[PDB]
What does this fold into?
Amino acid sequence: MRDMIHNISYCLMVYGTEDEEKVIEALRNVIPGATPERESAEGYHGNPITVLRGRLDRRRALREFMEKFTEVFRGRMDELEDRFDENGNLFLRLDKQKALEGVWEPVRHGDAIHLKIKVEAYPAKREVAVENIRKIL
Ligand code: NI
It folds into this structure.
């Protein structure tokens, strides 16, 4: 058995014209059952937002996520390789509008669902994390 990932931190924003329920529906197409904490902040162009944040470590959610992550990113490792940090983490941003339609679309900038994925890796280093995910993909 492998843990694969230790936990997932997530962040996404709700702008003034957005329906928070649909934003959360989009998040739940990436992490079903996610129940984010709310906090008021400023987003793009200083627009007031609610930030929806969470740190998820529930085994059932992590495993379901890895199942979908694996289907999505099988043979697409070259799209992820540069998104790892020096500490084992994989940073993945997905298009929020696409998520609402049930599609995982990696993006680099813009309005996204931000995931900070703590990859099971020892030593907790970029190369180890990369190798581990590539093997999975
Ligand atoms: Ni601007």
Notes: The CA atoms of residues 14 and 21 lie 10 Å apart.
